[PDB]
Coordinates of C-alpha atoms (C1' of nucleotides) in Angstrom, one line a residue:
Chain A
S15 CA 61.2 -33.6 -3.5
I16 CA 64.7 -33.5 -4.9
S17 CA 67.2 -35.6 -3.0
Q18 CA 70.3 -37.8 -3.3
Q19 CA 72.4 -39.7 -0.9
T20 CA 75.8 -38.7 0.3
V21 CA 76.0 -35.4 -1.6
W22 CA 77.2 -32.5 0.5
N23 CA 78.7 -29.3 -0.8
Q24 CA 82.2 -27.9 0.0
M25 CA 82.0 -24.6 1.8
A26 CA 85.5 -23.7 3.0
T27 CA 89.0 -24.9 3.5
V28 CA 91.2 -23.2 6.1
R29 CA 94.9 -24.1 6.2
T30 CA 96.8 -23.1 9.3
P31 CA 99.6 -20.5 8.9
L32 CA 102.8 -22.2 7.7
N33 CA 104.9 -19.5 9.4
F34 CA 103.1 -19.8 12.8
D35 CA 105.7 -19.1 15.4
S36 CA 105.2 -21.4 18.4
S37 CA 107.5 -19.2 20.5
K38 CA 105.1 -16.2 20.3
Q39 CA 102.0 -18.2 21.4
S40 CA 100.9 -21.9 21.2
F41 CA 97.5 -21.6 19.5
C42 CA 95.8 -19.7 16.8
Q43 CA 92.2 -18.9 15.9
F44 CA 89.9 -18.6 12.9
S45 CA 86.1 -18.5 12.5
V46 CA 83.8 -19.4 9.7
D47 CA 80.6 -17.4 9.2
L48 CA 78.3 -20.3 8.1
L49 CA 75.4 -18.1 6.7
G50 CA 77.3 -15.0 5.6
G51 CA 80.1 -16.9 3.8
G52 CA 83.1 -15.3 5.3
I53 CA 86.2 -16.6 7.1
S54 CA 88.1 -14.7 9.8
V55 CA 91.7 -15.2 10.9
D56 CA 94.5 -14.4 13.3
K57 CA 97.4 -12.1 12.8
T58 CA 99.4 -15.2 14.0
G59 CA 100.8 -15.8 10.5
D60 CA 99.8 -16.1 6.9
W61 CA 96.6 -18.1 6.7
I62 CA 95.6 -19.9 3.6
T63 CA 91.8 -19.8 3.5
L64 CA 89.3 -20.5 0.7
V65 CA 85.5 -20.4 0.3
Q66 CA 84.4 -22.7 -2.5
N67 CA 81.9 -21.4 -5.0
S68 CA 79.8 -24.6 -4.7
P69 CA 76.0 -24.6 -5.1
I70 CA 75.2 -24.3 -1.4
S71 CA 78.0 -21.7 -0.8
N72 CA 76.6 -19.5 -3.6
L73 CA 73.0 -20.0 -2.4
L74 CA 73.6 -18.9 1.2
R75 CA 75.5 -15.8 0.2
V76 CA 72.7 -14.6 -2.0
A77 CA 69.6 -15.7 -0.2
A78 CA 68.2 -12.7 1.7
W79 CA 65.8 -14.5 4.1
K80 CA 66.6 -18.0 5.3
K81 CA 64.8 -20.6 7.4
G82 CA 65.2 -24.3 8.2
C83 CA 68.0 -26.9 8.8
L84 CA 71.4 -27.3 7.4
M85 CA 73.8 -30.1 8.2
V86 CA 77.5 -29.3 9.0
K87 CA 80.5 -31.5 8.7
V88 CA 84.0 -30.5 9.7
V89 CA 87.0 -32.6 8.7
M90 CA 90.4 -32.0 10.2
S91 CA 93.3 -33.4 8.2
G92 CA 96.5 -33.1 10.1
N93 CA 100.3 -33.5 9.9
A94 CA 100.9 -37.2 8.9
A95 CA 104.6 -36.8 9.7
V96 CA 104.1 -36.6 13.4
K97 CA 104.3 -40.0 15.0
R98 CA 101.1 -40.9 16.7
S99 CA 103.0 -41.1 20.0
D100 CA 104.1 -37.5 19.8
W101 CA 100.6 -36.1 19.1
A102 CA 100.2 -33.1 21.3
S103 CA 97.4 -31.0 19.8
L104 CA 93.7 -30.4 20.3
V105 CA 91.1 -28.0 18.8
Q106 CA 88.2 -26.3 20.5
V107 CA 85.1 -25.7 18.4
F108 CA 82.4 -23.2 19.3
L109 CA 79.0 -22.5 17.7
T110 CA 77.9 -18.9 18.4
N111 CA 75.3 -16.7 16.7
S112 CA 77.7 -13.8 16.7
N113 CA 81.4 -13.0 16.9
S114 CA 80.8 -10.6 19.7
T115 CA 82.5 -11.7 22.9
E116 CA 79.3 -11.0 24.8
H117 CA 77.3 -13.8 23.2
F118 CA 77.4 -17.1 25.0
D119 CA 77.9 -20.3 23.1
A120 CA 75.1 -22.3 21.6
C121 CA 77.4 -25.4 21.6
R122 CA 80.9 -26.4 22.3
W123 CA 83.2 -29.3 21.4
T124 CA 86.9 -30.3 21.8
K125 CA 88.5 -32.7 19.5
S126 CA 92.0 -34.2 19.9
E127 CA 92.1 -37.4 17.9
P128 CA 95.6 -37.9 16.3
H129 CA 96.1 -37.0 12.6
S130 CA 92.4 -36.6 11.8
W131 CA 88.9 -36.4 13.0
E132 CA 85.5 -35.3 11.8
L133 CA 82.5 -33.6 13.4
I134 CA 78.9 -33.6 12.1
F135 CA 76.0 -31.6 13.6
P136 CA 72.9 -29.8 12.4
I137 CA 72.2 -26.1 12.7
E138 CA 68.8 -24.5 12.3
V139 CA 67.9 -21.0 11.1
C140 CA 65.0 -19.3 13.0
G141 CA 64.1 -15.7 12.4
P142 CA 61.7 -13.0 13.4
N143 CA 60.2 -12.3 9.9
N144 CA 58.1 -15.3 9.5
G145 CA 60.5 -17.7 11.1
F146 CA 62.9 -16.3 8.5
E147 CA 66.2 -14.6 9.4
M148 CA 68.3 -12.2 7.5
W149 CA 72.1 -12.4 7.9
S150 CA 73.2 -10.0 10.7
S151 CA 70.5 -7.6 9.9
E152 CA 70.0 -4.6 12.1
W153 CA 66.3 -5.1 11.7
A154 CA 65.2 -7.1 14.7
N155 CA 68.9 -7.2 15.7
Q156 CA 69.2 -10.4 13.8
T157 CA 72.2 -12.6 13.8
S158 CA 74.0 -15.5 12.0
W159 CA 75.8 -18.8 12.9
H160 CA 79.5 -18.7 13.4
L161 CA 81.8 -21.7 13.8
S162 CA 84.9 -20.7 15.7
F163 CA 88.1 -22.7 16.2
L164 CA 90.9 -22.4 18.7
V165 CA 93.7 -24.6 17.3
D166 CA 96.3 -25.6 19.9
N167 CA 99.5 -26.5 18.1
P168 CA 98.6 -25.5 14.5
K169 CA 101.5 -27.5 13.2
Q170 CA 99.9 -30.8 13.9
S171 CA 96.2 -29.9 13.4
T172 CA 96.8 -28.2 10.2
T173 CA 93.9 -28.4 7.8
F174 CA 90.1 -27.9 8.1
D175 CA 87.4 -28.5 5.5
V176 CA 83.8 -27.5 6.2
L177 CA 81.0 -29.1 4.1
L178 CA 77.3 -28.3 4.3
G179 CA 74.3 -30.3 3.5
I180 CA 70.9 -28.8 2.8
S181 CA 67.7 -30.3 4.2
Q182 CA 64.3 -31.0 2.8
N183 CA 62.8 -28.1 4.8
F184 CA 65.4 -25.4 4.0
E185 CA 63.5 -22.4 2.6
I186 CA 64.6 -19.0 1.4
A187 CA 63.1 -15.8 0.1
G188 CA 64.4 -12.7 -1.6
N189 CA 67.7 -11.9 -3.2
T190 CA 70.8 -10.1 -1.7
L191 CA 72.9 -8.2 -4.3
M192 CA 76.4 -9.4 -4.1
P193 CA 79.6 -8.5 -6.0
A194 CA 81.0 -11.2 -8.3
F195 CA 82.3 -14.3 -6.7
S196 CA 85.9 -14.8 -7.6
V197 CA 86.8 -18.0 -9.5
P198 CA 90.3 -19.4 -8.5
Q199 CA 93.1 -20.7 -10.7
Chain B
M8 CA 31.8 19.1 29.7
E9 CA 35.1 17.2 30.0
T10 CA 36.3 15.2 27.0
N11 CA 37.4 11.7 27.8
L12 CA 40.8 11.4 26.1
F13 CA 40.7 7.6 26.2
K14 CA 37.6 7.3 24.0
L15 CA 39.4 9.3 21.2
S16 CA 40.5 7.1 18.3
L17 CA 44.1 8.1 18.4
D18 CA 45.5 4.6 18.3
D19 CA 44.2 3.5 14.9
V20 CA 46.6 0.7 13.7
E21 CA 45.0 0.2 10.3
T22 CA 46.9 0.2 7.0
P23 CA 46.7 3.2 4.6
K24 CA 43.6 3.3 2.5
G25 CA 42.1 5.5 -0.3
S26 CA 42.4 6.7 -3.9
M27 CA 45.6 6.8 -5.8
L28 CA 45.9 10.5 -5.1
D29 CA 45.4 9.8 -1.4
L30 CA 47.9 6.9 -1.4
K31 CA 50.7 8.7 -3.2
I32 CA 53.8 8.6 -1.0
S33 CA 56.7 10.0 -3.1
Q34 CA 58.0 11.1 -6.5
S35 CA 61.5 10.5 -8.0
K36 CA 62.9 12.3 -11.0
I37 CA 65.6 10.1 -12.6
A38 CA 68.0 11.9 -15.0
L39 CA 68.6 10.3 -18.4
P40 CA 71.4 12.1 -20.3
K41 CA 71.2 12.2 -24.1
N42 CA 74.5 10.5 -24.3
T43 CA 73.7 7.5 -22.0
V44 CA 75.2 4.2 -23.1
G45 CA 73.8 1.1 -21.6
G46 CA 75.3 -0.7 -18.7
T47 CA 75.0 2.8 -17.3
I48 CA 73.5 3.1 -13.8
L49 CA 70.9 5.9 -13.7
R50 CA 70.4 5.6 -10.0
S51 CA 71.1 2.9 -7.4
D52 CA 70.0 3.6 -3.9
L53 CA 68.0 2.3 -0.9
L54 CA 64.4 2.0 -1.7
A55 CA 63.6 3.9 1.4
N56 CA 65.3 6.9 -0.1
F57 CA 63.2 6.8 -3.3
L58 CA 60.0 6.5 -1.2
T59 CA 60.9 9.5 0.8
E60 CA 61.2 12.3 -1.8
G61 CA 58.4 14.8 -1.5
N62 CA 55.6 15.4 0.9
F63 CA 52.5 13.9 -0.8
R64 CA 49.2 12.9 0.7
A65 CA 50.3 9.6 2.2
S66 CA 53.9 10.6 3.0
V67 CA 53.4 10.9 6.7
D68 CA 51.3 7.8 6.8
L69 CA 54.2 5.9 5.2
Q70 CA 56.4 7.2 8.0
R71 CA 54.0 6.8 10.9
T72 CA 52.3 3.5 10.3
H73 CA 53.9 0.3 11.7
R74 CA 52.4 -2.2 9.2
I75 CA 51.5 -1.5 5.6
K76 CA 49.6 -4.3 3.8
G77 CA 49.3 -2.8 0.4
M78 CA 52.0 -3.5 -2.2
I79 CA 54.3 -0.7 -3.4
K80 CA 53.2 0.6 -6.8
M81 CA 55.2 2.7 -9.1
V82 CA 54.2 4.5 -12.3
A83 CA 57.2 5.5 -14.5
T84 CA 56.7 8.0 -17.2
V85 CA 58.6 9.3 -20.2
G86 CA 58.0 9.2 -24.0
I87 CA 60.4 9.4 -26.9
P88 CA 59.8 9.4 -30.7
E89 CA 59.7 6.2 -32.7
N90 CA 62.9 7.0 -34.6
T91 CA 64.9 6.4 -31.5
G92 CA 64.8 4.0 -28.6
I93 CA 66.4 2.9 -25.3
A94 CA 65.9 0.1 -22.9
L95 CA 65.6 1.0 -19.2
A96 CA 65.2 -1.4 -16.3
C97 CA 63.9 -0.8 -12.8
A98 CA 64.9 -3.6 -10.4
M99 CA 64.0 -4.4 -6.8
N100 CA 66.1 -6.7 -4.5
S101 CA 65.8 -7.6 -0.8
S102 CA 69.2 -6.5 0.3
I103 CA 72.7 -5.7 -0.8
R104 CA 76.3 -6.3 0.5
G105 CA 79.3 -4.3 -0.5
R106 CA 79.9 -3.1 -4.0
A107 CA 77.4 -5.4 -5.6
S108 CA 77.0 -6.0 -9.3
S109 CA 74.5 -3.9 -11.2
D110 CA 74.5 -6.1 -14.3
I111 CA 71.0 -6.7 -15.7
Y112 CA 71.6 -10.4 -15.0
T113 CA 72.3 -9.9 -11.3
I114 CA 69.5 -7.4 -10.6
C115 CA 66.4 -8.8 -12.4
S116 CA 65.5 -11.9 -10.5
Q117 CA 63.2 -10.6 -7.7
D118 CA 60.9 -7.8 -9.0
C119 CA 62.2 -6.1 -12.1
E120 CA 60.7 -4.5 -15.2
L121 CA 62.4 -3.7 -18.5
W122 CA 60.8 -1.3 -20.9
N123 CA 61.5 0.7 -24.0
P124 CA 60.0 4.3 -23.8
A125 CA 59.7 4.4 -27.6
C126 CA 57.0 1.7 -27.2
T127 CA 55.8 2.0 -23.7
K128 CA 55.4 5.6 -22.5
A129 CA 53.9 4.9 -19.1
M130 CA 54.9 1.8 -17.2
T131 CA 53.4 0.4 -13.9
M132 CA 54.8 -2.2 -11.5
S133 CA 53.6 -3.4 -8.1
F134 CA 55.6 -5.5 -5.7
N135 CA 55.9 -6.8 -2.1
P136 CA 59.1 -5.6 -0.4
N137 CA 58.8 -8.5 2.1
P138 CA 58.6 -11.9 0.3
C139 CA 58.4 -13.9 3.5
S140 CA 55.1 -12.3 4.5
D141 CA 52.2 -9.9 3.7
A142 CA 53.3 -6.6 5.2
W143 CA 56.2 -4.2 5.2
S144 CA 57.1 -0.8 6.7
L145 CA 59.5 2.0 6.1
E146 CA 61.7 1.1 9.1
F147 CA 61.9 -2.4 7.8
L148 CA 62.9 -1.1 4.4
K149 CA 65.7 1.1 5.9
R150 CA 67.2 -1.4 8.4
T151 CA 66.9 -4.3 6.0
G152 CA 68.7 -2.6 3.1
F153 CA 66.0 -3.1 0.5
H154 CA 67.5 -1.9 -2.7
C155 CA 66.4 -0.3 -6.0
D156 CA 68.5 0.0 -9.2
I157 CA 67.5 1.9 -12.3
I158 CA 69.8 1.2 -15.1
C159 CA 70.0 1.6 -18.8
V160 CA 70.3 -1.8 -20.4
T161 CA 70.8 -0.5 -23.9
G162 CA 71.8 3.0 -24.9
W163 CA 70.0 5.5 -27.2
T164 CA 69.5 4.2 -30.8
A165 CA 69.6 7.8 -31.9
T166 CA 70.4 10.6 -29.4
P167 CA 67.7 13.1 -28.4
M168 CA 68.0 16.8 -29.0
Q169 CA 68.2 17.5 -25.3
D170 CA 68.7 15.6 -22.0
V171 CA 65.8 13.5 -20.8
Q172 CA 64.1 12.9 -17.5
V173 CA 62.0 9.9 -16.3
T174 CA 59.5 10.6 -13.5
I175 CA 58.4 7.9 -11.1
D176 CA 55.3 8.3 -8.9
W177 CA 55.3 6.0 -5.9
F178 CA 52.0 4.8 -4.3
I179 CA 50.8 2.4 -1.6
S180 CA 48.6 0.0 -3.6
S181 CA 45.2 -1.3 -2.8
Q182 CA 46.3 -4.8 -3.6
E183 CA 47.6 -6.7 -0.7
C184 CA 51.0 -8.2 -0.3
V185 CA 51.5 -11.9 -0.9
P186 CA 54.6 -13.9 0.0
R187 CA 56.9 -15.6 -2.5
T188 CA 59.3 -18.2 -0.9
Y189 CA 61.4 -20.9 -2.4
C190 CA 61.6 -24.3 -0.8
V191 CA 65.0 -25.4 -2.2
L192 CA 64.5 -29.2 -2.4
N193 CA 60.8 -28.8 -3.3
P194 CA 60.2 -26.3 -6.1
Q195 CA 56.7 -25.0 -6.7
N196 CA 55.0 -25.1 -10.1
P197 CA 55.6 -22.8 -11.8
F198 CA 59.2 -22.3 -10.7
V199 CA 59.8 -18.5 -10.9
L200 CA 63.4 -18.2 -12.3
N201 CA 63.7 -14.8 -13.9
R202 CA 67.2 -15.5 -15.4
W203 CA 68.6 -13.2 -18.0
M204 CA 69.7 -15.2 -21.0
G205 CA 71.6 -12.5 -22.8
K206 CA 71.4 -9.4 -24.9
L207 CA 71.3 -10.5 -28.6
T208 CA 72.5 -8.1 -31.3
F209 CA 71.8 -8.5 -35.0
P210 CA 73.7 -6.0 -37.1
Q211 CA 72.0 -4.6 -40.3
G212 CA 72.5 -6.7 -43.3
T213 CA 71.6 -10.1 -44.8
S214 CA 73.6 -12.1 -42.3
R215 CA 72.1 -15.0 -40.4
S216 CA 73.9 -14.0 -37.1
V217 CA 73.2 -17.4 -35.4
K218 CA 72.9 -17.0 -31.7
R219 CA 73.3 -20.0 -29.3
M220 CA 72.0 -19.8 -25.7
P221 CA 72.8 -22.9 -23.6
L222 CA 70.1 -24.3 -21.5
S223 CA 72.5 -25.6 -18.9
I224 CA 71.7 -22.5 -16.9
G225 CA 73.0 -23.5 -13.5
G226 CA 76.1 -21.9 -11.8
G227 CA 75.3 -18.2 -12.4
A228 CA 76.5 -16.0 -15.2
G229 CA 80.2 -15.8 -16.2
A230 CA 82.3 -12.8 -15.6
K231 CA 86.1 -12.1 -15.9
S232 CA 87.5 -14.8 -13.5
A233 CA 84.3 -14.6 -11.5
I234 CA 80.6 -15.6 -11.5
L235 CA 77.6 -13.4 -11.0
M236 CA 74.7 -14.9 -9.1
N237 CA 71.1 -14.3 -8.0
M238 CA 68.9 -16.3 -5.7
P239 CA 66.5 -18.2 -8.0
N240 CA 69.4 -19.2 -10.3
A241 CA 71.2 -20.3 -7.2
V242 CA 68.4 -22.7 -6.2
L243 CA 68.2 -24.3 -9.6
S244 CA 71.9 -25.0 -9.3
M245 CA 71.3 -27.2 -6.3
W246 CA 69.8 -29.9 -8.6
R247 CA 71.7 -32.2 -10.9
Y248 CA 69.4 -32.6 -13.9
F249 CA 66.2 -30.8 -14.9
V250 CA 63.4 -30.4 -17.6
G251 CA 60.3 -28.3 -17.9
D252 CA 58.2 -26.1 -20.1
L253 CA 60.4 -23.1 -20.6
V254 CA 58.8 -19.6 -21.0
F255 CA 60.9 -16.8 -22.4
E256 CA 60.1 -13.2 -22.6
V257 CA 61.7 -11.4 -25.6
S258 CA 62.1 -7.6 -25.5
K259 CA 62.8 -5.2 -28.4
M260 CA 65.5 -2.9 -26.8
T261 CA 66.1 -0.9 -29.9
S262 CA 64.2 1.7 -32.0
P263 CA 61.0 0.7 -33.7
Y264 CA 62.8 1.8 -37.0
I265 CA 65.1 -1.2 -37.1
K266 CA 63.2 -4.1 -38.5
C267 CA 64.1 -7.8 -38.4
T268 CA 62.4 -11.2 -38.3
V269 CA 64.0 -13.4 -35.8
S270 CA 63.7 -17.2 -35.8
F271 CA 63.8 -19.2 -32.5
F272 CA 64.2 -23.0 -32.1
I273 CA 65.8 -25.7 -29.9
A274 CA 68.8 -27.6 -31.3
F275 CA 72.2 -28.9 -30.2
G276 CA 75.5 -27.0 -30.1
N277 CA 77.2 -28.9 -32.9
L278 CA 75.2 -27.6 -35.9
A279 CA 77.0 -25.3 -38.3
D280 CA 75.7 -21.8 -38.8
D281 CA 75.0 -22.5 -42.4
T282 CA 72.8 -25.6 -41.7
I283 CA 70.2 -25.0 -44.4
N284 CA 67.3 -26.7 -42.8
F285 CA 67.5 -25.2 -39.3
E286 CA 63.8 -24.4 -39.9
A287 CA 62.8 -28.0 -40.3
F288 CA 62.9 -28.2 -36.5
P289 CA 59.8 -26.9 -34.7
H290 CA 60.4 -23.1 -34.7
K291 CA 58.7 -19.7 -34.1
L292 CA 59.1 -16.5 -36.2
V293 CA 59.1 -13.2 -34.3
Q294 CA 58.4 -9.8 -35.8
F295 CA 57.6 -6.7 -33.7
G296 CA 55.0 -4.1 -34.5
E297 CA 56.1 -0.4 -34.4
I298 CA 55.0 0.0 -30.8
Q299 CA 55.2 -3.5 -29.7
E300 CA 58.2 -4.4 -27.5
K301 CA 57.5 -7.6 -25.7
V302 CA 56.8 -11.1 -27.0
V303 CA 56.5 -14.3 -25.0
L304 CA 57.8 -17.6 -26.3
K305 CA 56.9 -20.8 -24.7
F306 CA 58.9 -24.0 -25.4
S307 CA 56.9 -27.1 -24.5
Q308 CA 58.9 -29.9 -22.8
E309 CA 58.3 -32.2 -25.8
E310 CA 61.1 -30.4 -27.5
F311 CA 63.2 -32.2 -24.9
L312 CA 63.6 -35.9 -24.9
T313 CA 65.4 -36.1 -21.5
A314 CA 66.3 -33.9 -18.6
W315 CA 69.8 -32.3 -19.1
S316 CA 72.6 -31.2 -16.9
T317 CA 72.0 -28.2 -14.8
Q318 CA 75.6 -27.3 -15.1
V319 CA 78.3 -28.1 -17.6
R320 CA 82.1 -27.5 -17.4
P321 CA 82.5 -24.0 -18.7
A322 CA 85.3 -24.9 -21.2
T323 CA 83.0 -27.5 -22.8
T324 CA 82.9 -27.1 -26.6
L325 CA 80.0 -26.7 -28.9
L326 CA 80.9 -30.1 -30.3
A327 CA 81.0 -31.8 -26.9
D328 CA 78.0 -30.2 -25.3
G329 CA 75.3 -32.7 -24.9
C330 CA 72.7 -30.3 -23.5
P331 CA 70.1 -28.5 -25.6
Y332 CA 70.4 -24.8 -26.7
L333 CA 67.9 -22.1 -27.5
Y334 CA 68.9 -20.8 -31.0
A335 CA 68.0 -17.5 -32.4
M336 CA 68.9 -16.3 -36.0
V337 CA 67.8 -13.8 -38.6
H338 CA 65.1 -15.3 -40.9
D339 CA 65.4 -12.6 -43.6
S340 CA 67.4 -9.5 -42.9
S341 CA 68.1 -6.8 -40.3
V342 CA 67.1 -3.5 -42.1
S343 CA 66.7 0.2 -41.3
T344 CA 67.2 3.6 -42.7
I345 CA 69.0 4.8 -39.6
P346 CA 72.2 3.2 -38.2
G347 CA 72.1 0.7 -35.4
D348 CA 72.0 -3.0 -34.7
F349 CA 68.7 -4.7 -34.0
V350 CA 68.9 -5.7 -30.3
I351 CA 66.7 -8.0 -28.3
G352 CA 66.9 -9.1 -24.7
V353 CA 65.9 -12.7 -23.7
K354 CA 64.8 -13.6 -20.1
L355 CA 63.8 -17.1 -19.0
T356 CA 60.8 -16.2 -16.9
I357 CA 59.3 -19.4 -15.4
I358 CA 59.6 -23.1 -15.7
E359 CA 56.4 -25.1 -15.7
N360 CA 55.8 -28.7 -14.8
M361 CA 59.5 -28.9 -14.1
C362 CA 61.1 -32.1 -13.1
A363 CA 64.5 -32.3 -11.4
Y364 CA 66.8 -35.2 -10.5
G365 CA 69.6 -35.5 -7.9
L366 CA 71.7 -33.0 -6.0
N367 CA 74.6 -31.2 -7.6
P368 CA 78.1 -31.3 -6.1
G369 CA 78.9 -28.3 -8.3
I370 CA 81.3 -27.3 -11.1
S371 CA 83.6 -24.4 -10.8
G372 CA 82.8 -21.3 -12.8
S373 CA 80.4 -20.7 -15.7
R374 CA 80.1 -19.4 -19.3
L375 CA 79.6 -15.8 -20.1
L376 CA 76.1 -14.6 -21.2
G377 CA 75.3 -12.4 -24.2
Chain C
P12 CA 57.8 20.2 -46.3
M13 CA 59.7 19.5 -49.4
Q14 CA 57.3 21.6 -51.5
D15 CA 54.4 24.0 -51.0
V16 CA 51.2 22.5 -49.8
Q17 CA 47.5 23.0 -50.5
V18 CA 44.4 22.4 -48.4
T19 CA 41.2 21.6 -50.4
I20 CA 37.8 22.4 -48.9
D21 CA 34.6 20.9 -50.3
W22 CA 31.4 22.9 -49.4
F23 CA 28.0 21.2 -49.1
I24 CA 24.5 22.0 -48.0
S25 CA 23.9 19.5 -45.2
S26 CA 20.9 17.2 -44.6
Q27 CA 20.9 18.3 -40.9
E28 CA 18.7 21.2 -40.2
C29 CA 19.8 24.6 -38.8
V30 CA 19.1 25.2 -35.1
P31 CA 19.5 28.6 -33.4
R32 CA 22.0 29.5 -30.7
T33 CA 21.2 32.7 -28.8
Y34 CA 22.4 34.2 -25.5
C35 CA 20.1 35.7 -23.0
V36 CA 22.6 37.9 -21.2
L37 CA 21.2 38.0 -17.7
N38 CA 20.0 34.4 -18.0
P39 CA 22.6 32.0 -19.3
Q40 CA 21.6 28.6 -20.5
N41 CA 23.2 25.4 -19.2
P42 CA 25.7 24.6 -20.5
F43 CA 27.0 28.1 -21.3
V44 CA 28.9 27.9 -24.6
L45 CA 32.0 30.1 -24.0
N46 CA 34.7 29.0 -26.5
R47 CA 37.4 31.2 -25.0
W48 CA 41.0 30.7 -26.1
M49 CA 43.1 30.3 -23.0
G50 CA 46.4 30.5 -24.7
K51 CA 49.1 28.7 -26.7
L52 CA 51.4 26.9 -24.3
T53 CA 55.0 26.1 -25.4
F54 CA 57.2 23.6 -23.6
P55 CA 60.8 23.6 -24.9
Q56 CA 62.7 20.4 -25.1
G57 CA 64.6 19.5 -21.9
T58 CA 64.0 18.5 -18.3
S59 CA 62.5 21.8 -17.4
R60 CA 59.2 22.0 -15.5
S61 CA 58.0 25.1 -17.5
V62 CA 55.1 25.9 -15.2
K63 CA 52.2 27.6 -17.0
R64 CA 49.6 29.7 -15.1
Chain D
rA7 C1' 53.2 -17.5 -10.7
rG8 C1' 53.5 -12.6 -9.9
rU9 C1' 53.3 -8.0 -12.4
rC10 C1' 50.8 -5.6 -16.6
rU11 C1' 47.0 -4.8 -20.1
rC12 C1' 42.0 -5.0 -21.1
Chain E
rA16 C1' 20.5 26.6 18.1
rG17 C1' 25.2 25.1 17.7
rU18 C1' 29.1 23.0 20.6
rC19 C1' 29.9 19.5 24.6
rU20 C1' 28.8 15.3 27.6
rC21 C1' 26.6 10.8 28.0
Chain F
rA18 C1' 25.4 22.3 -26.0
rG19 C1' 26.8 22.2 -30.8
rU20 C1' 30.2 20.0 -34.1
rC21 C1' 32.9 15.4 -34.9
rU22 C1' 33.7 10.2 -34.5
rC23 C1' 31.7 5.5 -34.3

RNA sequence: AGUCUC
RNA sequence: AGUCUC
RNA sequence: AGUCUC
């Protein structure tokens, strides 16, 4: 039973748009598809997003059928230049199994700590195959797990890192053919 | 006088059963041009589309039965003379997203067979399209995206007179489906890896042509500013260090007319190509018979003193690499009366009695395969 | 071939004894020895089916 | 392992 | 016879 | 069948 303490894997890093224009609207939104590996963003500005090709990130994108628990950790690193007394920002986090607006939320959080905060919670994959689930498959109208954010005042709550930890019971089967993963720099 | 409709056996939920003729569901004819080159995709489509060509005896059963328990069995057929050769691969994968890679490395991890028609003129393969369980169905195959790629791994050694055609007969097998799942932090024994190690080419002549294949196989296969990746290789990359009895499957992908004795052994990256006593290390000599195309090498874990890194920084040099390598070199010479290099393909099949330590944070990128 | 060829036939009196083989026209034996040539089939190189009847 | 072969 | 029904 | 092969 392979295991080691304190070793998560980086999954994504979303940087709020630098040219966000407060005057148009005050918040902006992005969503991370935890099991499919994609990041979605606003047309609110030029987002700087990135999905790291870490071991867990590569595994999930290529594992056809999944089942079991995963651990999620979100770390918001904000604008250190704002004085603590002028902090006027908050971010709403949502866990939904689909991006469709017709699906209710599995969970919901709202974080507003100044400069930085972290959020850790587990998610579990349950599917119809044999408890296995295929990412957004049309088969039994399967689904995924999306983590959506509504950042209010993107100039203070600027950065988000999403890390994932695999559990002892995570189990997969089958392979999904994917195009080459692009290596940065 | 009145028949009782209810008593009729019209709702029989049983799986298809019978002889091969009775269980034949489809037939595909794949075209193989005389000028095919290797890397060439002969046909890449949804499996459901291959299983749906032609109205054979069990064709409407395939379409009208909700659960099929037999595996899918295919019988590929095509013969070519001994003075030529080509290596074909028929690969099966659970799903596909976008313009996925068709490289032999990416496609051969689930259920895939590589054969050389100059040696094997009829090839059979059976598989379970649903690894999580013991049954499948045509709807499941369609809505799930189960994929099939038939590619040419190595082109013709000598081109045929005319164009060729490979015929594949598809059947529902009598053997039942069995699941194959991977518990990431708890590998089974043996661990089924199915990682392509590379395509080795040894040009005709007296040259040694030393080949070095790193055993730090985590992180996928390198590509141009990208990495290729398949599921089993992805799970092995989760661990930090590993060891095990390694089993390689070596295939002759070239014509039976190009002879060569290859020598395999384990050694470190820093040895010069001209090291005289490479063969003082435990080694194995491989020669193929005319019609023989597959050989299985098994490297015991006593060839390894310690577990090694699952992943090494891609730019690491041969001098600074501290992980073992699988070497391959020419023992005598690569000779023939027709032009062409002697080419073999190496695939790390399973790892037995494996032992892994720690979790891997990950290293960015990976080295290119052969 | 490069040159002309020659087939050599050696003839011997066998140790196996002769046995008759006659046909009673309106009373065939089983099996009935027919030895009928059905044809010489040619399948030219290519992907063609070349159905023969 | 599985597949294959026998 | 058969077919059918049971 | 036979012939052949073993």
